Design a protein around this ligand. Structure first.
Ligand SMILES: [Mg+2]
Lengths: 243, 250, 195, 240, 244, 111, 231, 241, 235
């Protein structure tokens, strides 16, 4: 034994235990989700209200990269911020050299290679976050989810954090019941419901819902936060479904 | 990141042993047998092409490598370690000699450069020793024909004939009985094939045996005519057919 | 600075160096000693660009003194002159070269022979019976070519040196304010206080 | 580069690598320094486990740092060469910039500074060397004797010893050295220094080295016969 | 991180010893014995090759005796590959000195330089020391004929006669017994071969197990000659001194 | 060839009284024969009862005043809000100016 | 246990023990309180002395005219982080002629602390910070943890016995958020908050440290007889 | 026992970290196969999409390294993409420096050399992947060259990689024992793909739909992957005789 | 082993806590601040009678208005003193004025936590920094290897510190004269020292606005010791 004391060491199984321990930090975090709709993507996250003293709507979790990509993550929040900072540098250099905004699959690999690089040496620690991200490019909508190992794939729907099992089951129903697809406005409503349903694994404290979206028709392919009336409408739809 | 292993991974134990070098020599011992014999008018180096799969094309894996037109090398131990050492040896023959003196290095000095590289992997920070022993055969104008063995420690010794790897102890005894200072190159090739047969289990033919010589200049392998002083390489790898012809007179 | 002369006789080396230091319009000093003792039996005189002359000389002095302490041994005049040449040969391809010309007068205690070396700022070294830098040789070499003998005494060398300085004082346009004369022999280095 | 912190604190507030460097000094051959009224004498032990030695060429235990200052040591011989070279370079650098040779205190302060630096720099171990530095300040006739150790602390001594069995010879010096009246001549000072080593040495043969430093760069090492005459006279007074 | 795997090659033991230096010296005690003897008219270097083979090409082989320049040679005891690294550095230092001062490097200055390089590996860098002990035989016009030894600690000392490698305790006692100050080279040649003959772990001392060298002013008039003995010449001197 | 310097004109005047001091300057900024501005302030309150003007090349002038104002801010941070005396400010400005000895601020400064 | 030797090692449950130990240094530190209305933001800090001959360790550091913080834990680490904030506030003013938003200052502190939690050789910061400020969106209060977590709050407390003050602020939330245009009453609420964390000792004239920033109020620190009015 | 954590020799002269990297190679539970035709080189690999929430078009272990070179990977996707990016960078640099397209065997050697370095240098870990490079080389013709975590590489007449490599290998061996030639004697690549799929079905004992496979084809001057509908056409032809 | 910058489960840096133990083994140093000046006193603690005690330098001048006393591994103090002197002189060069005593102390304390894997370990020495400036008058600071510095009316460091600090607790008042402070340092040093206190094994110094930092002659201190003996025999 001792194979789990140092990053980048293969165990006799062929496993990197330090990466598996980073996943435990992710599983300990709050629930975050992503839904791919007809012409875009929707992101939503559960924000635990630890105290009344937290200023409502102020501690924003979802982050924008460039102007067309949204990122949300569960686990160690600072690690997620570090990853988004790198993503913003990658997107800037791509646009600097190639003029066009970075395509989502291209952006996915940039994050992937960077996270994977933190599994190659014992002088660094793996990322303690799973990141759900995506947006609209010239080939349409894309949704991705990236793990501490550096592994990522494209998704129809994605979920991570403490209530991921509940969320996944809800996402699977939507995929089955809508083979033709989901509208952006429908996806915002559904995202609100799924976070409310996933909050059962975190039922002790109450929470604040935060939603964002990129849609070709609804936001012109730019990342925007769901605010005011549209947010309240989604909260009402969600509250109606849990009762 | 940064390589933060700036300390030696090979150190002296209380008994004075350098563990990592000893263990590298153990890896060489497990390796497939290779040998070298020096004649009056040439040198022969030989080994078995132990194919990992019959679907593998073993002609694409070269165990005997040309280092310079007059110097060749064979190994026992870890193949990948050998391959990168051949790359480094080919380059150092140019950078530290041919680009300075306008001629290829003598055998003993190229051996010296390869040895230095292997010594440094035994003392430098954050590396292990090379897991190979090399047999280097060559010719140069002032030293004539020569054969050298280089070990993981970086130590090298000149031989009349020797063997390394799996069945080296038995092979060296076989060579002691047959070697004399009057052997012609064809006699040395014959002895090489006899010696190698003892350590080979399965098929023994031109397709499973790799054999090369350092002998006469080959003007037919030069690729150009017109310069009298350029007469062609002394290193030549024997073909599958050439080996089989000498296996009938075996 | 200006005039530096050297002459190797039977048993000693004599170095003569001018006393004037001129800052363009005015003669700021008339008692300047343009020499450094490198070791008990080795003396170096120097001339060239202001500042660089003394900086180079003291740098060489420090290095030879360091060697002497490390080995408890005095380097031969030949060895010292080779070290100095290499420093100047290195300097000439530097970002800003030392613009310094030197004479090295030493008595070799092993061979029991005086030795005079002339080295210019490029690192051009020659061993000579007599030498100079700048325009000094143009006025003095015809006198030295005539009168010099390898078996001259120290007193005869000083007399030939006086004739050289007299010719310099007659035909040179600059007033160099006389010379300081030093003798290097088996007993070391001493200054002739009346010249 | 190799950056590992080898000299660190332990729970009881000790730096073991520095303390183990002192143990190397304890193993080294004995060195002693005694200052008279107008001189300083440095005595050194030579272990006679090594004969067939060529004494002409073998590194001598007392080293001139400049024409007026000397340095002797106990501990690792190879380590001492590095400190001696650094001190010699600094001595010439001081002459070059200040236009005055080093004071004995300044040279001591420099060497001690180098030793301290090697106790809190990454990737290095402390020097296994303690030194005795002796001489006279330029244009001064007051004798100077200082001691340094691996930690980098230094101080001035009327008389001091370092190395193996230095506890014994310090015992001798503490009862035989009077501060109100130090050894008034070279003879008396050399005699007291040879006497102190005879408490520890074995045969008074090629086992004792003596170097006398007087004012104005007057440094000389005594020969076997000269020391042998002190050895002879000491025991003939002892037979009583 | 990486600290976990660091052996810390440059630390003191509680007794104030350098672990790696001590262990490197243990390694050297298993190497073939090398002997140096200094006489009034020259120096002898004699060394034993380690258990050889009949198929080893001896006349082109060198593992013990190396030329540093025309005036200085070394006998090696320890890791041959480690020694060649240091030998090449020493050869360069000698040429650097010759270029700078236009005089051959004094023997002690070369010895001090190599010894300082060894010392560095014991104090900084976190690398293993060189597992090599040298015997330096040389001549310069200041001290004449000189013998030195250096070991992995970087410490060096001068000698009239000295051994390194295996059985140094036995060898040094035999040398101490028969060495005299007025000895000549031909007498020293005999002493060196007689000492190796008695201390060897082999059954008998033969030419194929030896390397031999002399530094003589037996070079026509005030100059010095190095002679690395050929296999046949070692065979002849073994017969002359009555060992075979 | 690119010339890194320019001349923005302007004239400034400082007079010290018994218990007061004035620093005056015209408000005109120019290049060659053209007027850039009829009112471009040139004398600045730098805090701690110190006024400053760096006249000549306006880019260098603005840069120097900006760096001195910054130096006053950091003097307060580093030295427990101690008031920067006029003599201390003057010595500090010398070091700001001499820091660019071989590529100077092309200005004449008065505080 | 086997996983607390350095910051580069996760435990089998996904914890970072060196970061958790750094968090423990804050809990040993002296109590400090932060709270705000819509016009002002206030810091109150209980200063700790070594003994009766000693001074009371300062707890509040000014970062700009519109921003500053209070510390609990390793004081030299607070000096490093506050120096970084001073530079970032300064860079924003010099380059962009713009006062650095309090929220952006929190993001910068988070990222600086994070780098010390993912690399070998380094260590986490051993200090907690309460940042108050007034910018273009009004009054703000932030809480910084050396894990990297930065949180915007109406009120909070960190240090030893900070739980008493935090519960009081949670009760008083609806009252103190409405104290607009009255600096003295907001400080009173803060002094009453920090009192819920005192045991055996009470607030004296060299014990108490108060800071305030607001609409027309530069960040200013009150010590000595300037806080006697609130005792 | 720190000789098991970093790439230094064990007392038996073994490198355990290299051996454990070979074990990571089978973590995806996917088998791949490569064969050579007259004019082409075909590589097939199992495709498993276990989650319904996944976009199946993004799940792939075949990579287009250059116009001429394709690469299939056996091992975790993060290490696979690491190797893919590097191979693409190396191939592009080669063409820039030496003025001609990097050969398949030369790229394999280069990646093998990089892998060798990870087995000798302590600070770098081996990649837990096996890389099979395919092309129709302008000098050597149809080519298969395979690299592993030990830094070993060699050319193949045909090859197989994955948990059930032995079954596929023996099946391929038996066919080439019959035919006595080093390739599939077929004109079109379509039929060489059909051969590859048929012999994988035989060896594994499992049937495949269009979504269970992933196919890459190398011809003169281009490497390309087949769509699900191209694979379906291939499966229909197999079933119809 | 374990990092040099590692936190303990209690939230303390191991290496800093261990260096504090080394300081406890050091010779005693005492400082007393009055409105007439600050006094600094040290125990010299020579290891042998042959050691010339006036070469023991544990009280040091940083500038004319700032002095300093040390306790612990005193070799470690040399680079700290060098930095302090450089900082004092540099500030005078940049600002044509004396540096504040607090600012000087803060500059020294910035060096403290610059260790890791910068120097390889913390300093093993504590400093008492005493001085005067126009803004805050006479001041005494205690600089630790933790990077923390406290201002004190009076403070003792080294092996006899907790006994000495209890004594300073009782004796200090805001009306002490310079002469009263001198005798008080001598009295408390005499209490905690192993050997009997005299002018050769103890040293006094002070900093006043008028005369600056001064190390007392052995003759001057000897008189103050005699004055102490007589006033203790006076009741
Ligand atoms: Mg590795």
């Amino acid at each position: 034994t001792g194979y789990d004391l140092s990053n980048s060491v293969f165990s006799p199984d062929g496993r990197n235990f330090q990466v598996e321990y980073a996943v435990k930090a992710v599983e300990n975090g709050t629930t975050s989700i992503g839904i791919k709709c007809n012409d875009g993507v929707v992101f939503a996250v559960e924000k635990l209200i630890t105290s009344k003293l937290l200023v409502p709507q102020k501690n924003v979790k979802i982050q924008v990269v460039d102007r067309h990509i949204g990122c949300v993550y569960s686990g160690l929040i600072p690690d997620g911020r570090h990853l988004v900072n790198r993503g913003r540098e990658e997107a800037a250099s791509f646009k600097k050299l190639y003029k066009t905004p970075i395509p989502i699959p291209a952006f996915a690999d940039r994050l992937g290679q960077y996270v994977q690089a933190h599994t190659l040496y014992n002088s660094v620690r793996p990322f303690g976050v799973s990141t759900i991200f995506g947006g609209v490019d010239k080939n349409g909508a894309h949704l991705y989810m990236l793990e501490p190992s550096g592994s990522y794939w494209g998704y129809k729907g994605a979920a991570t954090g403490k209530g991921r099992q509940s969320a996944k089951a809800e996402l699977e129903k939507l995929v089955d019941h809508h083979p033709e697809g989901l509208s952006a406005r429908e996806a915002v409503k559904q995202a609100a419901k799924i976070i409310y349903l996933a909050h059962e694994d975190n039922k002790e404290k109450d929470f604040e819902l935060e939603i964002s979206w990129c849609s070709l028709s609804e936001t012109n392919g730019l990342h925007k936060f769901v605010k005011g009336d549209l947010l309240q409408e989604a909260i009402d739809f969600a509250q109606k479904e849990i009762n | 990141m940064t390589d933060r292993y700036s300390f030696s991974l090979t150190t002296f134990s209380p008994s004075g042993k350098l563990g990592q070098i000893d263990y590298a020599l153990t890896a060489v011992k497990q390796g497939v047998t290779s040998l070298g014999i020096k004649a009056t008018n040439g040198v022969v180096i030989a080994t078995e092409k132990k194919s990992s799969s019959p679907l593998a094309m073993s002609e694409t894996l070269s165990k005997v490598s040309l280092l310079t037109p007059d110097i060749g090398a064979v190994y026992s131990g870890m193949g990948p370690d050998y391959r990168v050492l051949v790359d480094k040896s080919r380059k150092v023959a140019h950078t530290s000699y041919k680009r300075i003196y306008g001629e290829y290095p003598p055998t003993k000095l190229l051996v010296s450069e390869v040895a230095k590289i292997m010594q440094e992997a035994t003392q430098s920070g954050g590396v292990r020793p090379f897991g190979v022993s090399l047999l280097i055969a060559g010719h140069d104008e002032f030293n004539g024909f020569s054969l050298y063995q280089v070990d993981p420690s970086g130590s090298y010794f000149p031989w009349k004939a020797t063997a390394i790897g799996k069945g080296s102890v038995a092979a060296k005894t076989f060579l002691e009985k047959r070697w004399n200072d009057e052997l012609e190159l064809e006699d040395a090739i014959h002895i090489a094939l006899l010696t190698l047969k003892e350590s080979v289990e399965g098929e023994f033919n031109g397709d499973t045996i790799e054999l090369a010589i350092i002998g006469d200049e080959n003007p037919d392998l030069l690729g150009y005519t017109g310069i009298p002083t350029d007469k062609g390489p002394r290193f030549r790898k024997l073909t599958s057919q050439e080996i089989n012809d000498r296996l009938e007179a075996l | 600075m200006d005039i530096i002369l050297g002459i190797r006789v039977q048993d000693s080396v004599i170095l003569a160096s001018s006393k004037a230091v001129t800052r363009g319009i005015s003669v700021l000093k008339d008692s300047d000693d343009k020499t450094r003792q490198l070791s008990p039996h080795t003396l170096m005189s120097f001339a060239g660009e202001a500042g660089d002359t003394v900086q180079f000389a003291e740098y060489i002095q420090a290095n030879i003194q360091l060697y002497s302490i490390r080995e408890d041994y005095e380097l031969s005049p030949q060895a010292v002159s080779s070290f100095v040449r290499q420093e100047l040969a290195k300097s000439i391809r530097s970002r800003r070269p030392y613009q310094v010309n030197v004479l090295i007068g030493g008595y070799d205690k092993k061979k029991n022979k005086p030795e005079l070396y002339q080295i210019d700022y490029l690192g051009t070294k020659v061993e000579l019976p007599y030498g100079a830098h700048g325009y000094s040789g143009f006025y003095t070499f015809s006198l030295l070519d005539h009168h010099y003998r390898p078996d001259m005494t120290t007193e005869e060398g000083l007399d030939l040196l006086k004739l050289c300085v007299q010719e310099l004082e007659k035909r040179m346009p600059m007033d160099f304010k006389g010379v300081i004369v030093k003798i290097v022999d088996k007993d070391g280095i001493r200054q002739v206080d009346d010249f | 580069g190799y950056d590992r912190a080898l000299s660190i604190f332990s729970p009881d507030g000790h730096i073991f690598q520095v303390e183990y460097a002192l143990e190397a000094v304890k193993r080294g051959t004995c060195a002693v320094g005694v200052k008279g009224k107008n001189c300083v004498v440095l005595g050194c032990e030579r272990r006679s486990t090594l004969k067939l030695q060529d004494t002409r060429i073998t590194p001598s235990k007392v080293s001139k740092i400049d024409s007026h200052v000397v340095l002797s040591f106990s501990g690792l011989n190879a380590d001492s060469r590095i400190l001696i070279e650094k001190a010699r370079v600094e001595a010439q650098s001081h002459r070059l910039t200040l236009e005055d040779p080093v004071t004995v205190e300044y040279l001591t302060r420099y060497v001690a500074g180098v030793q301290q630096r090697y106790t809190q720099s990454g990737g290095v171990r402390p020097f296994g060397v303690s030194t005795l530095i002796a001489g006279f300040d330029p244009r001064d006739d007051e004798p100077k004797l200082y001691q340094t150790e691996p930690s980098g602390i230094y101080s001035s001594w009327s008389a001091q010893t370092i190395g193996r069995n230095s506890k014994t010879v310090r015992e001798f010096l503490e009862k035989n050295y009077d501060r109100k009246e130090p050894p008034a001549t070279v003879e008396e000072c050399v005699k007291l220094t040879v006497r102190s080593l005879l408490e520890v040495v074995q045969t008074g043969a090629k086992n004792i080295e003596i170097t006398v430093v007087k004012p104005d760069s007057d440094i000389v090492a005594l020969s076997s016969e000269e020391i042998n005459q002190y050895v002879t006279q000491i025991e003939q007074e002892k037979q009583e | 991180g990486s600290r976990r795997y660091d052996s810390r090659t440059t630390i003191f033991s509680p007794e104030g010893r350098l672990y790696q230096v001590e262990y490197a010296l243990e390694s050297i005690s298993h190497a073939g014995t090398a002997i140096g003897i200094m006489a009034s008219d020259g120096i002898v270097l004699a060394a034993e090759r380690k258990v050889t083979s009949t198929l080893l090409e001896q006349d082109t082989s060198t593992e013990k005796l190396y030329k540093l320049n025309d005036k200085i040679a070394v006998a090696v005891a320890g890791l041959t590959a480690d020694a060649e690294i240091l030998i090449n550095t020493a050869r360069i230092h000698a040429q650097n000195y010759l270029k700078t001062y236009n005089e051959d490097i004094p023997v002690e200055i070369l010895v001090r330089r190599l010894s300082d390089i060894k010392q560095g590996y014991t104090q900084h860098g976190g690398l293993r020391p060189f597992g090599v002990s040298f015997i330096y035989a040389g001549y310069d016009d200041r001290y004449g004929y000189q013998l030195y030894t250096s070991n992995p600690s970087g410490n060096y000392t001068g000698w009239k006669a000295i051994s390194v490698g295996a059985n140094t305790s036995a060898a040094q006692t035999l040398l101490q017994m028969d060495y005299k100050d007025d000895m000549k080279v031909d007498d020293a040649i005999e002493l060196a071969l007689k000492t190796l003959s008695k201390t060897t772990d082999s059954s008998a001392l033969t030419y194929d197990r030896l390397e031999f060298a002399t530094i003589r002013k037996g070079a026509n008039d005030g100059e010095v000659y190095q002679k690395i003995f050929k296999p046949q010449e070692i065979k002849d001197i073994l017969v002359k001194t009555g060992i075979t | 060839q690119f010339n890194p310097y320019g001349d923005n004109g302007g004239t400034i005047l400082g007079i010290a009284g018994e218990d007061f001091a004035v620093l005056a300057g015209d408000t005109r900024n120019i290049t060659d024969y053209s007027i850039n501005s009829r009112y471009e302030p040139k004398v600045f309150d730098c805090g701690d009862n110190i006024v400053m003007s760096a006249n000549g090349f306006a880019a260098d002038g603005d840069a120097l005043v900006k760096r001195f104002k910054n130096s006053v801010k950091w003097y307060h941070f580093d030295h427990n809000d101690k008031k920067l005396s006029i003599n201390s400010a003057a010595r500090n400005i010398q070091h700001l100016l001499y820091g660019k000895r071989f590529f100077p601020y092309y200005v004449h400064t008065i505080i | 246990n086997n996983y607390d030797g350095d910051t580069v090692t996760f435990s089998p449950t996904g914890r970072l023990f060196q970061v958790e130990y750094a968090l423990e240094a804050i809990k040993q530190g002296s109590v400090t309180v932060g709270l705000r209305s819509n016009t002002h933001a206030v810091l109150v800090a209980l200063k700790r002395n070594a003994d009766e001959l000693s001074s009371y360790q300062k707890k509040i550091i000014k970062c700009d005219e519109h921003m500053g913080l209070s510390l609990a834990g390793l004081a030299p680490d607070a000096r490093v982080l506050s120096n970084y904030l001073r530079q970032q506030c300064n860079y924003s003013s010099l380059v962009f002629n713009r006062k650095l938003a309090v929220e952006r200052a929190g993001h910068l502190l988070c990222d600086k602390a994070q780098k010390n939690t993912q690399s070998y050789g380094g260590r986490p910061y051993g200090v907690g910070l309460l940042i108050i400020g007034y910018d273009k969106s009004g009054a703000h209060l932030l809480e910084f943890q050396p894990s990297g977590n930065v949180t915007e709050l109406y009120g909070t407390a960190i240090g030893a016995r900070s739980q008493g003050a935090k519960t009081y602020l949670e009760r008083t939330l609806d009252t103190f958020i409405k104290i607009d245009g009255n600096p003295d009453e907001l400080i009173k609420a803060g002094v009453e908050a920090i009192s819920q964390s005192l045991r055996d000792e009470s607030l004296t004239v060299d014990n108490l440290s108060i800071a305030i920033v607001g609409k027309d109020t530069p960040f200013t620190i009150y010590d000595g007889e300037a806080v006697a009015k609130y005792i | 026992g720190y000789d098991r954590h970093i790439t230094i020799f064990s007392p038996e002269g073994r490198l355990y970290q290299v051996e454990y990297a070979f074990k990571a190679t089978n973590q995806t539970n996917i088998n791949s196969l490569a064969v050579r035709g007259k004019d082409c080189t075909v590589v097939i690999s199992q495709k498993k999409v276990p989650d319904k929430l996944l976009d199946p078009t993004t799940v792939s272990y075949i990579f287009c390294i250059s116009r001429t070179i394709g690469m299939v990977v056996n091992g975790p996707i993060p290490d696979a993409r690491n190797a893919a990016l590097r191979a693409k960078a190396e191939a592009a640099e080669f063409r820039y420096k030496y003025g001609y397209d990097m050969p398949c065997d030369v790229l394999a050697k280069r990646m093998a050399n990089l892998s060798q370095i990870y087995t000798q240098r302590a600070y770098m870990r081996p990649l837990g992947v096996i890389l099979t490079f395919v092309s129709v080389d302008e000098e050597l013709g149809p080519s298969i060259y395979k690299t592993d975590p030990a830094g070993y590489y060699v050319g193949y007449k045909a090859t197989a990689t994955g948990p059930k490599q032995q079954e596929i290998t023996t099946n391929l061996e038996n066919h080439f024992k019959k035919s006595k030639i080093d390739h599939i004697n077929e004109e079109s690549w379509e039929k060489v793909v059909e051969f590859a799929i048929t012999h994988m079905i035989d060896a594994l004992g499992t049937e495949f739909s269009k979504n269970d496979l992933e196919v890459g084809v190398a011809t003169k001057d281009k490497f390309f992957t087949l769509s699900a509908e191209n694979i379906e056409e291939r499966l229909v032809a197999i079933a119809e005789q | 082993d374990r990092g040099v910058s590692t936190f303990s489960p209690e939230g303390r840096l191991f290496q800093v806590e261990y260096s504090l133990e080394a300081i406890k083994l050091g010779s005693t140093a005492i400082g007393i601040a009055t409105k007439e000046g600050v006094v600094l006193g040290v125990e010299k603690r020579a290891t042998s009678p042959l050691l010339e005690s006036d070469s023991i330098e544990k009280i040091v001048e940083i500038d004319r208005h700032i002095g300093c006393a040390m306790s612990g591994l005193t070799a470690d103090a040399r680079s700290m003193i060098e930095h302090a002197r450089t900082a004092a002189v540099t500030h005078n060069l940049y600002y044509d004025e004396d540096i504040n005593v607090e600012s000087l102390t803060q500059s020294v304390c910035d060096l403290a936590l610059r260790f890791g894997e910068l120097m390889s370990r913390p300093f093993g020495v504590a400093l008492l920094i005493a001085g005067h400036d126009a803004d805050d008058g006479y001041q005494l600071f205690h600089a630790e290897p933790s990077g923390t510095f406290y201002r004190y009316n009076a403070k003792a460091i080294g092996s006899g510190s907790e006994g000495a600090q209890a004594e300073l607790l009782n004796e200090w008042h805001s009306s002490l004269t310079l002469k009263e402070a001198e005798l008080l340092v001598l009295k408390i040093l005499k209490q905690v020292m192993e050997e009997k206190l005299d002018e050769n094994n103890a040293q006094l110094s002070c900093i006043t606005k008028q005369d600056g930092f001064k190390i007392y002659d052995n003759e001057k201190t000897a008189e103050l010791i005699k004055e102490l003996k007589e006033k203790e025999a006076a009741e």
